[PDB]
Amino acid sequence: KIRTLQGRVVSDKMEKSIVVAIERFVKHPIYGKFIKRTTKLHVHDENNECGIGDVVEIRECRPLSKTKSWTLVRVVEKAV
């Protein structure tokens, strides 16, 4: 109903902000091979609730910062 994406959390060291690797799976435009392509996004989280290696689900919002325009909605597979 609303557009959202998923991915691993790469780092969480800066407060109220995490960086999330969304790994899309595209075809090569020439050779036809399917290549994993990784997209890093800076995501605003309230309360610093995510960790490294965490899978997260994010949505797009108004720009919070210079490099940050994304906010998570919920967390799946929190633990190690």
Binding site: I30, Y31, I35
Partner: protein
């Protein structure tokens, strides 16, 4: 040749250089004659090829063959080279346009007459 290898390192082509670099992708360039002289050719041939060392307009110093029989070419003469090499001369890559800005047409030539800048002989 493996499809993973071409993703990581694609098929790079061969940037082919031009064998007439002084023209600089122009059809003809105006030059000034520095030295008009003759040259003996490679080993299967034997002649005295009339060929001139030319300072061009863009700044390059190339030598240029003078086609046809006879030429009124001197030093400090303003000619127009066009590109196209003489095989049997080492290093000559250009042809002078006969009939351009100082060079005269070939005297009394009646076949392939436009390749040497000679008017139609009216009866």
């Amino acid at each position: 040749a493996t499809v993973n290898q071409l993703v990581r390192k694609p098929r790079a082509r061969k940037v082919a250089k031009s064998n007439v670099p002084a023209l600089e992708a122009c059809p003809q360039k105006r030059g000034v004659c520095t030295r008009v002289y003759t040259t003996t050719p490679k080993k299967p041939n034997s002649a005295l090829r009339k060929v001139c060392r030319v300072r061009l307009t863009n700044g390059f110093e190339v030598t240029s063959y003078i086609g046809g029989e006879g030429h009124n070419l001197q030093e400090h003469s303003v000619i127009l080279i066009r590109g196209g090499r003489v095989k049997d001369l080492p290093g000559v890559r250009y042809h002078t346009v006969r009939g351009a800005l100082d060079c005269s047409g070939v005297k009394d030539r009646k076949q392939a007459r436009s390749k040497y800048g000679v008017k139609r002989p009216k009866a």
